[PDB]
Amino acid sequence: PSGTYAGLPIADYGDAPPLSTKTMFWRTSPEKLPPGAWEPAYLGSKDERVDGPSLQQVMRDQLKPYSEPRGLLPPQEILDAVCDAIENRLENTLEPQKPWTFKKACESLDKNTSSGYPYHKQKSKDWTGSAFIGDLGDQATHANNMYEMGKSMRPIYTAALKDELVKPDKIYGKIKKRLLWGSDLGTMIRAARAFGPFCDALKETCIFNPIRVGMSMNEDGPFIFARHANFRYHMDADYTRWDSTQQRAILKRAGDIMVRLSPEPDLARVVMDDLLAPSLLDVGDYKIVVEEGLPSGCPCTTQLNSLAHWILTLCAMVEVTRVDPDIVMQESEFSFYGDDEVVSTNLELDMVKYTMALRRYGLLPTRADKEEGPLERRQTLQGISFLRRAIVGDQFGWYGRLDRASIDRQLLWTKGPNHQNPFETLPGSQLMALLGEAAMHGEKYYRTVASRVSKEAAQSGIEMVVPRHRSVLRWVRFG
């Protein structure tokens, strides 16, 4: 079978299941939603809210960016210098680790997700509490033996659409639904055995290194934000379509770093070469070949993406300041979580040329006002957003507080089993977390949220104590 699907070459026939037409989101009260409120994403032809396209068409629209022409590669000298600097800092920072066993790699996986190709069964269905059995067991054992033998296997990714609350324009206007990459159990296990040590050692230094994957916002957040605030200028590029716009060369440099820092470099080399090769995405009908972009299905993909972001940012700064990357990196503090970034620096950065170099690389940096022009740099960290939270500071220190919209949203919607009508009320913890996140907004918003939770929990399950603002504020700030 040959042809062209969504601008991307076709490799084989699709073994993926049909796209889900149900959502996990239930309403908390049968009342009408407030105007302008958020709703679960489009659910297909069975969605009774609107008459829209097929989910296949939305996935094709989301797959269009992966066919787009790439940007320019950074200068080779600058790129080499920045990769060497990053690798050397990680050498000085990372604690050497012992290789991961097959058992630990199997125990690291989430059993509440699909096994991917070819069985597409929920992992927990073949889990005994110790190891994998059955079909998934054979898959795991074959993957492990191929890992130990240093033999290549080609990964098969499965395309899906993300069930989440979206802006109403994304349902009643131009319908859009985010594309998710699922990975197969064999590739998951190979990547686990290969890069589990690296990811764990990187998590142990989530404070001393800009790759913040694994941090705790309530405990480790304030330290990270004080470290950032030690600096003069602050920025957040807020990229649009970060994963679709990536170049495989940057990910190859990042993966080379990850391999060189891994305890079993040859096996991780084989697994990374398999991961970064042209990927086979199963869109249901066909298996297509995606040559560029980020395959965001693997368990270690977040660390890899963050490293790529680090590389790109440092490259841009060396292109603007023309000083060596170590000079920038000793005069700067970075925070990277995939596509999310916070950059604090003391260097006088020409934001015009900085944005020009970023856009030259194929990236899509956006101002907050969504207008054209250079990126903005501020002299204070307050107001910047990271992990959907805003960075605030007071006499007690810095902290990250969840925005108000997300709190109201989680008050309106609760997660549950999959159903078809998102406005069905569920007749069946998170409320206390919402109370805590609202406490950081003042006593007014805390009183509002407290009234809402008190009225809610008296229509369902069991009663719940509604603490004073000061007590819950103390608990979430200083635990």
Write down the least CB distance from residue 144 to its own copies, Å.
Answer: 42
**What's the closest the beta carbon of residue 305 comes to its own copies, in angstroms?**
22
For its own copies, which is the closer residue by CB, 34 or 69?
A: 69
CB of 85 to its own copies, least distance (A): 13
- Judged by the rule CB under 8 A, the positions of this chain that interact with its own copies are 69-73, 75, 321-324, 326-327, 330-331, 346-348, 353, 356, 359-360
What CA–CA distance (Å, rounded) separates 154 from 271? Answer: 9
Query: CB 321 → its own copies: shortest distance, Å?
Result: 6
Peptide bond into 35 cis (omega under 30): no
In the complex, the smallest distance separating the C-beta of residue 7 from its own copies, rounded to whole angstroms, is 14
CB of 169 to its own copies, least distance (A): 26
The answer on whether 220 is annotated among ligand-binding residues is no
Strand partners, 411: none
Residue 329 CB, nearest approach to its own copies (Å): 10
Q: How far is CA 423 from CA 352, 419, 452, in A?
A: 47, 10, 19
Q: Is 138 annotated as a binding residue?
A: no
The β-bridge relationship of strands 156-161 and 279-282 is parallel
Could you tell me which of 282, 256, 267, 252 has the C-alpha nearest to residue 155? 282
Q: How far is the CB of 61 from its own copies (least distance, A)?
A: 19
- Residue 256 known to bind ligand: no
State the minimum distance, in angstroms, from the CB of residue 366 to its own copies: 15
Our CB check for its own copies shows the closer of 148 and 348 to be 348
SS3 per residue for 401-453: EECHHHHHHHHHEEEEEEECCCCCECCCCHHHHHHHHHHCCCHHHHHHHHHHH
For its own copies, the closer CB: 259 or 316:
316
Of 70 and 142, CB closest to its own copies: 70
Is residue 236 annotated as involved in ligand binding? yes
Rounded Cα–Cα distance for residues 161 and 198 (Å): 29
Give the shortest CB-293-to-its own copies separation in angstroms. 15
Of 226 and 356, the one with the shorter C-beta distance to its own copies is: 356
| CA pair distance 148, 141, nearest whole angstrom | 11
15 assigned binding-site residue? no
Q: Which is nearer to its own copies, 113 or 366 (CB)?
A: 366
Where is the binding site, in residues? 236, 238, 340-341, 385
Where is the binding site for Mg(2+), in residues? 236, 238, 340-341, 385
